[PDB]
């Protein structure tokens, strides 16, 4: 557990894992994304491993809003993956098992923020916020280790692009084409309009 956990005003529940919009974001490379029409049944607690469409939920750090969409091409067997290591402070949850996503979120809060990869009821890997980037040169090695391991695991589970941290960091960047996830919902960068909107929690 955590003596000093991330004191978010909310816990992530199954109600934050309701997916309904027919459109998701598809990775062209590590950062460039385009709209795509979801081709699979996004009502299931567990998604199949024979495709590369994963649930993606973006959650307000303050718990007011959330965006429930799909990301195609991030991975094909990531069960639960949560990161609070964003420049906005907002929370990203990606995966194919809603229970593992909830578990990774709870564990992320327990360790005081950061990155948590969970799988089949267990925590596969975690990086506390202090080790997600090299804030202190003293910790460089540790950072590197924590990072590389994460890479390896994500690469084993279908992440084929160069840098998943890059991906996560630029999901909300409305100046990079072609579609982004914003507090107002998914966002068409070229037409500068909200597509399907966010949900008030």
Numbering used by the authors: 380 to 580
Verbatim from the authors:
YerA from Bacillus subtilis is considered a novel class of enzymes that are capable of catalyzing the deamination of 6mA to produce hypoxanthine. YerA is the first identified binuclear metal-dependent enzyme that specifically catalyzes the hydrolytic deamination of 6mA, representing a novel class of deaminases. Additionally, YerA has been shown to possess conserved key amino acid residues that form a binuclear metal center. Our deamination assays showed that N6-methyladenosine (N6-mAdo) served as a more favorable substrate than its base derivative 6mA.
Here, we report the high-resolution structure of the C-terminal region of YerA, which exhibited a compact architecture composed of two antiparallel β-sheets with no obvious close structural homologs in Protein Data Bank. Despite extensive trials, only two constructs pET-28a(+)/YerAAla15-Arg580 and pET-28a(+)/YerAGly380-Arg580 successfully produced crystals, after removing the N-terminal 6 × His affinity tag. While the former construct produced poor-diffracting crystals, pET-28a/YerAGly380-Arg580 readily crystallized with a cubic morphology in ammonium sulfate or potassium phosphate as the precipitants. The cubic crystals belonged to a tetragonal system, with the space group P41212, and each asymmetric unit contains one molecule with an estimated solvent content of 51%. Continuous and well-defined electron density was observed for the entire polypeptide chain, except for the first two residues introduced by cloning. The refined model comprised 201 amino acids and 101 water molecules, with refinement statistics summarized in Table 1. The YerAGly380-Arg580 structure adopts an α+β fold with a globular shape, divisible into two domains: an N-terminal β-sheet of eight antiparallel strands flanked by helices (Gly380-Leu550) and a C-terminal β-sheet featuring three antiparallel strands (Gln551-Arg580). These domains are spatially close, forming a compact structure devoid of central cavities or concave surfaces. Analysis by the PISA server indicated that YerAGly380-Arg580 does not form an oligomeric structure within the crystal lattice. A DALI search for YerAGly380-Arg580 homologs retrieved only remotely related structures with RMSD scores generally ranging from ~5 Å or above, with 70–90 aligned Cαs, indicating that the domain’s structure is unique. Attempts to express various YerA constructs without this domain invariably rendered the remaining enzyme insoluble, suggesting a structural role. During the structural comparison of YerA’s Gly380-Arg580 domain with MAPDA, we found that this domain may function as a lid covering YerA’s active site, presumably playing an equivalent role to MAPDA’s α4-helix.
